[PDB]
Design an enzyme around this catalytic site. Sequence first.
Site, PDB file in Angstrom:
ATOM      1  CG  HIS A  77      -2.308  -0.784   0.996  1.00 42.37           C
ATOM      2  ND1 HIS A  77      -2.458  -2.176   1.733  1.00 42.37           N
ATOM      3  CD2 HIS A  77      -3.071  -0.642  -0.037  1.00 42.37           C
ATOM      4  CE1 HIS A  77      -3.736  -2.452   1.365  1.00 42.37           C
ATOM      5  NE2 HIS A  77      -3.979  -1.816   0.112  1.00 42.37           N
ATOM      6  CG  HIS A  81      -1.990   0.217  -4.218  1.00 48.99           C
ATOM      7  ND1 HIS A  81      -2.292  -0.849  -4.646  1.00 48.99           N
ATOM      8  CD2 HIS A  81      -2.754   1.124  -3.584  1.00 48.99           C
ATOM      9  CE1 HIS A  81      -3.914  -0.811  -4.385  1.00 48.99           C
ATOM     10  NE2 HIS A  81      -3.774   0.388  -3.509  1.00 48.99           N
ATOM     11  CG  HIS A 115      -6.887   4.508  -3.376  1.00 43.01           C
ATOM     12  ND1 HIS A 115      -5.578   4.509  -3.866  1.00 43.01           N
ATOM     13  CD2 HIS A 115      -7.101   3.340  -2.953  1.00 43.01           C
ATOM     14  CE1 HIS A 115      -5.192   3.171  -3.696  1.00 43.01           C
ATOM     15  NE2 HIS A 115      -5.782   2.556  -3.240  1.00 43.01           N
ATOM     16  CG  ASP A 116      -4.694   2.448  -0.235  1.00 46.31           C
ATOM     17  OD1 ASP A 116      -5.542   2.358   0.462  1.00 46.31           O
ATOM     18  OD2 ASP A 116      -4.399   1.706  -1.164  1.00 46.31           O
ATOM     19  CD  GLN A 278      -4.171 -14.183  -5.299  1.00 49.63           C
ATOM     20  OE1 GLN A 278      -4.429 -13.399  -3.989  1.00 49.63           O
ATOM     21  NE2 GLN A 278      -4.081 -13.259  -6.310  1.00 49.63           N
TER      22      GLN A 278
HETATM   23  C1  LIG Z   1      -4.106 -18.601   2.998  1.00 49.01           C
HETATM   24  C2  LIG Z   1      -3.344 -17.718   1.913  1.00 49.01           C
HETATM   25  C3  LIG Z   1      -4.367 -16.861   1.394  1.00 49.01           C
HETATM   26  C4  LIG Z   1      -5.530 -16.584   1.784  1.00 49.01           C
HETATM   27  C5  LIG Z   1      -6.318 -15.742   1.260  1.00 49.01           C
HETATM   28  C6  LIG Z   1      -7.815 -15.399   1.435  1.00 49.01           C
HETATM   29  N1  LIG Z   1      -7.781 -14.438   0.797  1.00 49.01           N
HETATM   30  C7  LIG Z   1      -7.012 -14.091  -0.114  1.00 49.01           C
HETATM   31  C8  LIG Z   1      -6.969 -12.976  -1.228  1.00 49.01           C
HETATM   32  C9  LIG Z   1      -5.587 -11.915  -0.746  1.00 49.01           C
HETATM   33  C10 LIG Z   1      -5.964 -10.884  -1.560  1.00 49.01           C
HETATM   34  C11 LIG Z   1      -6.487  -9.780  -1.300  1.00 49.01           C
HETATM   35  N2  LIG Z   1      -6.542  -8.570  -1.617  1.00 49.01           N
HETATM   36  C12 LIG Z   1      -6.056  -8.507  -3.045  1.00 49.01           C
HETATM   37  C13 LIG Z   1      -6.215  -7.223  -3.639  1.00 49.01           C
HETATM   38  C14 LIG Z   1      -5.833  -7.337  -5.222  1.00 49.01           C
HETATM   39  C15 LIG Z   1      -4.991  -8.277  -5.695  1.00 49.01           C
HETATM   40  C16 LIG Z   1      -4.965  -9.487  -4.857  1.00 49.01           C
HETATM   41  C17 LIG Z   1      -5.509  -9.599  -3.620  1.00 49.01           C
HETATM   42  N3  LIG Z   1      -5.523 -10.672  -2.933  1.00 49.01           N
HETATM   43  N4  LIG Z   1      -6.155 -14.890   0.268  1.00 49.01           N
HETATM   44  C18 LIG Z   1      -6.127 -17.415   2.637  1.00 49.01           C
HETATM   45  C19 LIG Z   1      -5.349 -18.538   3.402  1.00 49.01           C
HETATM   46 MG   LIG Z   2      -7.555   1.538   1.031  1.00 50.93          MG
HETATM   47 ZN   LIG Z   3      -5.779   0.786  -2.397  1.00 47.97          ZN
END
Ligand SMILES: c1ccc(-c2c[nH]c(CCc3cnc4ccccc4n3)n2)cc1
Ligand SMILES: [Mg+2]
Ligand SMILES: [Zn+2]
Lengths: 321, 321
Positions: A77, A81, A115-116, A278
């Site tokens: 962040h 980004h 935004h961040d 993912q």
């Molecule tokens: C072990 C490893 C990952 C996870 C897990 C759960 N949910 C996610 C997604 C992570 C994430 C969050 N926000 C994003 C924003 C943009 C691009 C990719 C992103 N990936 N990852 C759960 C257990």
């Molecule tokens: Mg934000």
């Molecule tokens: Zn953001």
Amino acid sequence: SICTSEEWQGLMQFTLPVRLCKEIELFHFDIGPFENMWPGIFVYMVHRSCGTSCFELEKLCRFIMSVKKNYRRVPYHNWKHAVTVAHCMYAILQNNHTLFTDLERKGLLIACLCHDLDHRGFSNSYLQKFDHPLAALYSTSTMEQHHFSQTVSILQLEGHNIFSTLSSSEYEQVLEIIRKAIIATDLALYFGNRKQLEEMYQTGSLNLNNQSHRDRVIGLMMTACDLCSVTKLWPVTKLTANDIYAEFWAEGDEMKKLGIQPIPMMDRDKKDEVPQGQLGFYNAVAIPCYTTLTQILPPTEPLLKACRDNLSQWEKVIRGE
Amino acid sequence: SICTSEEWQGLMQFTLPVRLCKEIELFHFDIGPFENMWPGIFVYMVHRSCGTSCFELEKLCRFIMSVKKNYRRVPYHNWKHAVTVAHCMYAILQNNHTLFTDLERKGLLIACLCHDLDHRGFSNSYLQKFDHPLAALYSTSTMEQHHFSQTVSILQLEGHNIFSTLSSSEYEQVLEIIRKAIIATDLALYFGNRKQLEEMYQTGSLNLNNQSHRDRVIGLMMTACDLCSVTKLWPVTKLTANDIYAEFWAEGDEMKKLGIQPIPMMDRDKKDEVPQGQLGFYNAVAIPCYTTLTQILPPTEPLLKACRDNLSQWEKVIRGE
Ligand SMILES: c1ccc(-c2c[nH]c(CCc3cnc4ccccc4n3)n2)cc1
Ligand SMILES: [Mg+2]
Ligand SMILES: [Zn+2]
Ligand SMILES: c1ccc(-c2c[nH]c(CCc3cnc4ccccc4n3)n2)cc1
Ligand SMILES: [Mg+2]
Ligand SMILES: [Zn+2]
């Protein structure tokens, strides 16, 4: 946190290389290899979209380099980004040229860069769990409320207010486009938002003449730009993921240090489950988001298509290919 | 309930990305990210298993979109489910192509698409506890008998009869393949059907051109199709479970509203017990299904393999991992 006289003057003399004038228009453009140009790139996009008579070249360069300064060296962040997100909103606004009011285009590209602002690399959840001063200030959309706050402070600096050539009402207007748009980046809010937009688009009741309806669309555009690494090309997408998890895992390290179990997404010990996480994320968050945006705004198609391509790559990773 | 000409005419000219073609052939294929392409995914599937010359393009597209329009807005037993069941059949047919007649493959793909037609989201047991109209008309396999009534109503809709050009022998023949197929998706019947086929196989008496043995294999293929979320990769499987319980819990809430306690499966105040219910479902229903199917149809082995994978994933959720 103000920029030096040396910084904004250095930005005034930047001109983008010709061999990137085409590419910057591609939704899948990766700013990665061009770190020195990120602030100039933003100026470029701002000039294409709003023109060279919109902001005073001097004031705009102050703003940008201050904004830069107020981003932290957190793994994801961070300045990079902000400029990734602002760009996606550029590509989006370009391919929809005659739909958004002049004030919206200025507001949104600014809102995206800002935004961040001043992100600590900690979730909203974290700050409330451990009674952070910022959670004390703002009870909900904690980081987001702070990001808007940070934005308003930068504009109130000397020679930084880039909205100087507007009425009080037009200035009142834009500082609300910016407010709503940043508050939209709170992913928790997104789910509800996208759900109503779905209902509305079906029943045919989506009125772009309606103001509260417009906010909702800008809302989804905000989310759509926020997640845009799911729409880059596979080697770019892979690398940003590592940055995402470095930040998540660092938060979980801080949680452990306090003898507290982080959720599996923030635990290094569960590295192996990233591909699944993912896929889960693409399927539950990304696809719906981009599927709906493409519905509302047909020209955004390449976003969904790129998301679908990345989805399959994670699928291949899970399957051992 | 008819559809509009806007929809079916669009379907006609749809063409399918070259990358999907290679992947629709896979057992694990998830159709989730492609909601717009679902009606045209079925078309492709028919054409590849039955031939492009098999149905008249226009009458098919009308059928498909009117089937779509007759699926309700319920959490699980909806349009997406229909097209997933149909895709699982496709992959089973393709891997065992010569074992079935062109008439059987035609009817089985269509029976998979129409198998939950007009599902309100209430089980057989509900309707027969609460004396529903449909339960007085159909007393065994209540909903399934209605789903077949629905299929015929859509075939009897003007301009929708895709079997018009079959012989009179073959027409009443295909509607009987279809009738039996839908009825076999009533899970109550499955356990008896499974036990029988399991017996016939072990004592070498299973015979594919013995029609009653044939109907028993078809029925089991239908169940295996109906349950195929359990053969998808974990994050796909997990997300579907949510939709399933989201629907089970909406039915328990109705019984509670009426003042009667639902079984733990349909009570949301008992989510805790979900992984243990999935555990037992896999061990009692799912595994046995794909186990026996793989014995009769060895090329379906990837279905048993993936199901066992998700059984391991649910065993891990219980164990606190
Ligand atoms: C072990 C490893 C990952 C996870 C897990 C759960 N949910 C996610 C997604 C992570 C994430 C969050 N926000 C994003 C924003 C943009 C691009 C990719 C992103 N990936 N990852 C759960 C257990
Ligand atoms: Mg934000
Ligand atoms: Zn953001
Ligand atoms: C509390 C919570 C759940 C349960 C429970 C019992 N049995 C099940 C399985 C539910 C079910 C039904 N049908 C499926 C089809 C495909 C994939 C999963 C499915 N799970 N769940 C019992 C007590
Ligand atoms: Mg059913
Ligand atoms: Zn079904």
